[PDB]
Every structure is written in structure tokens, then in C-alpha cells.
Amino acid sequence: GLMQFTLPVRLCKEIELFHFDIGPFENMWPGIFVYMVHRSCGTSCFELEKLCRFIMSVKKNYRRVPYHNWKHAVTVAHCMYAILQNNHTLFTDLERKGLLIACLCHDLDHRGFSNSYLQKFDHPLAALYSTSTMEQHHFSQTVSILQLEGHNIFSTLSSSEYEQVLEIIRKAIIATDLALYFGNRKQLEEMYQTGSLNLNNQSHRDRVIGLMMTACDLCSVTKLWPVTKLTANDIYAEFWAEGDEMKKLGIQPIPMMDRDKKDEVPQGQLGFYNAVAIPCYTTLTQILPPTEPLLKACRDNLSQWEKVIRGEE
Numbered sequence: 001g002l003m004q005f006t007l008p009v010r011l012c013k014e015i016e017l018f019h020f021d022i023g024p025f026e027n028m029w030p031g032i033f034v035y036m037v038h039r040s041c042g043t044s045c046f047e048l049e050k051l052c053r054f055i056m057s058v059k060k061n062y063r064r065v066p067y068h069n070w071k072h073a074v075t076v077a078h079c080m081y082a083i084l085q086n087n088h089t090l091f092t093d094l095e096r097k098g099l100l101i102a103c104l105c106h107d108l109d110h111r112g113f114s115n116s117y118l119q120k121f122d123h124p125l126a127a128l129y130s131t132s133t134m135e136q137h138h139f140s141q142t143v144s145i146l147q148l149e150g151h152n153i154f155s156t157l158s159s160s161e162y163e164q165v166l167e168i169i170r171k172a173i174i175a176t177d178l179a180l181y182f183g184n185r186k187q188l189e190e191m192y193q194t195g196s197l198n199l200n201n202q203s204h205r206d207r208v209i210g211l212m213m214t215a216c217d218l219c220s221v222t223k224l225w226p227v228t229k230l231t232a233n234d235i236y237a238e239f240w241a242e243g244d245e246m247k248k249l250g251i252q253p254i255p256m257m258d259r260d261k262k263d264e265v266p267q268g269q270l271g272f273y274n275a276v277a278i279p280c281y282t283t284l285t286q287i288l289p290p291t292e293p294l295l296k297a298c299r300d301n302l303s304q305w306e307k308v309i310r311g312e313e
């Protein structure tokens, strides 16, 4: 109850900034998350013992893959923490509880492969979940862990508040399917530009939380350049393994997944910044002005990939 988590001074300060890197000390990441729940939500929103037990079972259900691993879960939660802390009054009590949990759980049991590859492989998950295949699985794994004995961190909510929190989590995790981001962001662009955007409308709040999810999920593009560049190596380690597995099913992979087209990464990064990331952070900044540092850092990283192409690195 009177047991605050405290970080060393440098982390205490930098954890409040959008561009914080959680560091290479895995054993500090649970403490970093609890710190963030305690400041974002309150020391009372979860029983510490149940929260620690939930965090450790979540960690165990992330796999040893290059990118979609436990470090990604905690990194995405931190980006959400920074959004929430910069927008203190915009979010409900249930939202603050659900959203850091959603981010921690949003890639549970990821195997390092896309929805596309599961469907070409004919994986059993592609028969159970015909769209947003991995994202429905990540949600199913979150509910499984919530039901383990002594892992119900929501045990003190009413029936209807529990239903509401699990719905915020389900929609927040589904929204991390980038296939859904394009049309979510177009509707938010139109809604904002015609002045129809209404944060009392639940279906509008859902769209805004969806965009916050894409923003936190893609947040490697918002870090200092060496973090961005080193994270991209892990991203391609996965893409290129998927490509290899496409070649084993007799399917030429897309160039993004073909390690033989390593050469064209820089231009592929530009496309991604221009088509996905910059538009994501631009619309987020229109809706939630205090998130502007995410857009500014993304633009800085776009300029770094432009320097790589000009062989200035």
C-alpha cells in the first residue's frame, strides 16, 4: 500500500519522455511497468501481488523471437504511458486500467510471422480466426492468463465494469492489426476535418484508442536514431525468416521479406514512414496535441533514412 516503486534518477526522469528506451536489463522491465501503472492509474487500481503474478505469466507467454518479444510488449506499454500522462484529463478510470494492460498483452504468444503467412501455411489459427488472425489469438491469450488462479487483476470491478474493461482491451488489441489502421485513420481524418469528432461518442473514442494503439505499436520510429536503426534490424530478422518460410512453401515473398532485397531497405523505410507512420502521428497530434513529440521524432527519423539513401550514412 505505502510501497511505491522508484527508479534511478535518469530513468525516473527519462521514463516520462516519449523517446525513452527501456534498456537491456530485462529484470528491470516488470518494475518499469508497475511504476507506470502506479503513476498512470494509481497504487490502488491493482493488488500488487496479483499484478506481479499477471506480469510474470504475460512475460512467460511471449516467445524468444527477434522483434515480437517481451521487450516490444513493455516498449509499447511505455509509449501508451507517455500518451496517457500527457493527456491526464481525457481518459476514464477504466481506460487507464485497460490500456497499459492491452499494450503489455497485445502480441502475446506471437510466433514472428504475419497473418498472411499463417493463412498461406494453413495454420490452425487461420481457420479459428479468419481476419486479424494473430490479434484475436493475442486477445484469447490475455483472457486465458486473466483466468489463471490469483491472476484476476480486475477482481474488484463490477460485472459491467469488468465487461467494459475487457472490451477496451479486445478493441485495443484488434486495432493493432495494421490492415485495419488505414481505414481507421481515414475516418478519423474526415471526422476531425469536418468537425464531427466527438469524444463523448463511444464509437469515436474507440477509433481514437485504436489510433493510440497503432502509434504505440509503431513507436520504434519515434526513438533516438540509434534505437530506431537497431530496432529495424530485429524487425527485418523476423521479416526475412518469414520470407525464407514463404520460399519453403514455394511462394516468392514480398521484397520486405526477401533477404536478397536487403539493398532496398532504406527506400522501403521511406514508404513506411510516408504511408503509415507520419500519417499516424500527424492525425494523433491533431486529436491529442500533447503527443506532438512523437510526430517530431518520426519526422527526424524519416530525415535519417533520407540521409542513408544519399550515402551520408
Ligand SMILES: COCCN(C)C(=O)c1cnn(C)c1C(=O)Nc1ccn2cc(-c3ccccc3)nc2c1
Pocket (backbone or CB within 6 Å): 176, 178, 217, 218, 220, 221, 232, 235, 255, 256, 257, 261, 262, 264, 265, 267, 268, 269, 271, 272
Ligand atoms: C504492426 O507491425 C509490426 C512490425 N511491422 C509489421 C511493421 O511494419 C513495422 C513496425 N515498425 N516498423 C519500423 C515497421 C517496418 O519497418 N515496416 C516496414 C513496412 C514496409 N516495408 C517495406 C520494406 C521494404 C524493404 C525492402 C525492400 C522493399 C520494401 N520495408 C518495410 C518495413
Ligand SMILES: [Mg+2]
Pocket (backbone or CB within 6 Å): 106, 107, 134, 176, 177
Ligand atoms: Mg501484433
Ligand SMILES: [Zn+2]
Pocket (backbone or CB within 6 Å): 072, 076, 106, 107, 176, 217
Ligand atoms: Zn506489436
